[model samples]
Target: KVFGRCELAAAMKRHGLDNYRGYSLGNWVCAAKFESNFNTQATNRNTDGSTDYGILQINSRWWCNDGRTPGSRNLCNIPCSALLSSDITASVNCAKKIVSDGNGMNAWVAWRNRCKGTDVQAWIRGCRL
Candidate 1:
């Protein structure tokens, strides 16, 4: 499920990700836009027998266990399969947990490389949010 920018924004807002931390909702939208292009089913395999799942590329290395990553910590306590679903509850919740775990949103490579310390407000322009 590829999401339009505003659609993803609305969904994220519904899940209380908007300003969940010091980061703005636009920052969340920025990660989704660049990380996985808003695709709910996106996945990326890591060389260390780990994989990243879903829109924000939550890694199996420590977040969700895919039963494949050799270093899985399963901190999210949800199956990696759950991240691939259009229902984003687990993904959003997991992201919040990761952020609260002292990682902030820096765990996301997309956000680190693209959104962090940048003008994220452009992501929500004209979205009416």
Candidate 2:
């Protein structure tokens, strides 16, 4: 199964995430799959007509604050937010930093810590291919 354009998977392996299976790292991949088509360039128009962008599907306004345009410059060098515009490796690293605080589970933990409140399998389901 592919998730987050396989970037999430790449990040997991780079971080040696396999060490902690079924934990936060796994959850992050699931979340990415559920949220985006794994496309780092992903963009969506919300019901409110707002825009969400990048692999993590971060709302353009969250980083851009311009409301109308969503671009990498919006995040600039925010580290974590920059991942939304940068390469998959950078994005995954940024996500991991946010999720683990430099020690958590990285992107995988984003789902474990954030989405764990709901059905986790839903993320995996999005990866079915």
Candidate 3:
């Protein structure tokens, strides 16, 4: 149910937050615990039934969906596997871009903000992503 330390280390480095001291691995582990419940294959179905796929719930329809298909979904120029296939740095960077419009760690500010006050584990357990 937990990411290997090396995977976690690579993920933090990829996110450009390895130097960040406020939130520790315990905090991130908690966030991942909440975001997709540590399920790298997690997917979400919007009300329209479009999909968000992979660990951080990347919205596949956003990247993959095109108007031509019956489902109105297009293929993401960058596949989820492209991100997942790499180290955590790659995956977290991808997640940051998706959430922060390419701002990276600024996207994780929420983790340092709202989650800072609570136990890293508890905060992550309650995190939304």
Candidate 4:
């Protein structure tokens, strides 16, 4: 797993993710917190038979190939297992591609349900950005 909230923020910032695609770092961090609690190995099965993978919880239906799941579109052209590693460079790149596709952070249901219009500052509270 990643270190924690602060470390995640630091890494993200270091990776040039701060204010990426016009979305705040707090928004990314907040959505990730709800999606996987900053855990890179995180995965979840959706009701639609697709699965969410990694820190961004990218959906298998459109993003990555999980092998077991059929009909994967694999827009990111990456294996889902690669997203489950501590090195989030690929995951972050995939996430940027997802946002670039015009979904923004709205691609993440957790962001829409939990972070939209909320005070996201708390997600970065105490973090020396």
Candidate 5:
């Protein structure tokens, strides 16, 4: 599903991402926009052959098992396919794991480059939290 901004915000909130690890809901929503443009089917293979999946662009190397990336740790213990589901629960849950594991939102370079230090209120401006 191509999520509207408010819809995405609601989902992020439902999954307990609001103020998660000190990153606000707007931060999560804003980073997701840049990561995958709210596309659940998004996939990107990096230069090291690791892949990113879904709206949050979860990494294959440290999180999901794509059965392709070499040396995948599969820390989330789930298939990358789960991250592709439009339901978004798996993606959000795995993201929580990633965030709690030393990196927080810093795991997403896109967030650091685009969402971090930026005014992200627009991402959730009209959303009812």
Candidate 6:
């Protein structure tokens, strides 16, 4: 499922991510834009042979099982495809768990490279939050 910026922001807020896990909503929105552009089915093959899944690009190395990959801890205890759905509750919950593990949004390279220290407010500009 593809989401517009406002729709994505609304969903993230409803999922309790507006300010949860010590990260701001702008950070989440900004990261999502760079990571997947709000495309739920987005996936990327990593240089390490692992793949990233869904809007947050959660990694197969530690979060979910893609079946083709080995050494996946599946810490989210979900199939990688689960993150590719329009309903993002599972993905959001998994992300919360990941952040709780201390990496925070730094787990997403897009966040590190694109969102870090940037003015993320533009990501949600004009949205009625």
Please, what are the lDDT tens digits per residue for candidate 3 over residues 1-129? 246444554556456653344445555554555555555655566676655544455555555442322445333466545434434444455554454455433344444454445675443343333
> What is the per-residue lDDT of model 6 for residues 43-96, given as tens digits with 9 covering 90 to 100?
999888889989999999999988877766899999999999999888898999
> Model 6, residue 85: what's the lDDT?
96
In order, the Cα lDDT scores of the candidates are: 0.89, 0.51, 0.49, 0.88, 0.92, 0.89
Question: Between the candidate structures 1 and 4, which one is better when assessed by TM-score?
Answer: 1
**TM-score of decoy 2:** 0.49
* Per-model TM values vs. the true structure: 0.95, 0.49, 0.50, 0.93, 0.97, 0.95
| Cα lDDT for residue 23, candidate 1 | 78
* Residue-by-residue lDDT tens digits, candidate 1, 1-129: 888999899999999999998878999999988889999999988878888899888888899888877756999999999998988888899999888888788888779988999999999888966
Error of 3 at 102 (Å): 9.1
lDDT of 5 by residue, 1-129 (tens): 889889999999999999999989999999899999999999998999999999999999999999999988898899999999879999999999888989779899999999988998879997787
Residue 120 of model 5 has an lDDT of 82
Sliding window of 10 residues with minimal summed lDDT for model 2: 72-81
TM-score of 1: 0.95
Q: Residue-wise lDDT of candidate 4 within 19-79, one digit each (tens)?
A: 8998778888998899998999999999888999999899999999988678769999999
When summed lDDT is taken over every stretch of 10 residues in candidate 4, the lowest stretch is 9-18
Residue pairs with backbone atoms closer than 3 Å in model 4 (clashes): none
Residue 120 error, candidate 5, Å? 1.4
lDDT of 2 by residue, 8-59 (tens): 6556556654434445444656667656656666667767555665666554
Model 3 lDDT-worst window of ten = 66-75
Worst 10-residue stretch by lDDT in candidate 1? 63-72
Give per-model CA RMSD.
Answer: 1.0, 7.0, 6.9, 1.2, 0.8, 1.0
Please give the lDDT score at residue 53 for candidate 2.
55
